[PDB]
């Protein structure tokens, strides 16, 4: 399972954060800072895969904001990238032309979508249309 998934900008600002492992607040902040430093000090030809603290630290940012995940060494690496791409596509479909500025304003919506997509570090919605329909129905509830 994914220990923690967080969205961070290129400058170091974090646009998302979702950890599935209970850690101390100071320890969590230190881990996030170390992950940002490793990602911020990584080239474009590093394969987007890092084994930091025995965790599959996969970094793949399609824009100025980067995305990272940390999972145990028990599954294929391409599965994490596929899940990240599917989540990004679902978020773009839910929002529409998602940008960095819109991410800050829609933090609650993004958190709700992430919770409805993956729970506890495991995949919860394999389909892409069903999750979008459920999110739309939940939003229309009020």
């Amino acid at each position: 399972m994914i220990h923690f998934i967080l969205l961070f900008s290129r400058q170091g600002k974090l646009r998302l954060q979702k950890w599935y492992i209970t850690l101390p607040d100071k320890e969590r902040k230190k881990i996030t800072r170390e992950i940002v430093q490793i990602i911020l000090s990584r080239g474009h030809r590093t394969s987007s895969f890092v084994d930091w603290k025995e965790l599959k630290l996969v970094y793949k940012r399609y824009a100025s904001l980067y995305f990272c995940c940390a999972i145990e060494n028990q599954d294929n690496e391409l599965l994490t990238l596929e899940i990240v791409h599917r989540y990004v596509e679902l978020l773009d479909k839910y929002f529409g032309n998602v940008c960095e500025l819109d991410i800050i304003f829609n933090f609650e919506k993004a958190y709700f979508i992430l919770d409805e997509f993956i729970i506890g570090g495991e995949i919860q919605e394999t389909s892409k249309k069903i999750a979008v329909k459920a999110i739309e129905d939940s939003d229309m509830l009020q």
Binding site: A63, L65, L101
Partner: peptide, 10 residues
């Protein structure tokens, strides 16, 4: 800027 750009450009 670089923030208003689409994450996937789609």
């Amino acid at each position: 800027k670089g923030e208003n750009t689409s994450l996937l450009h789609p």
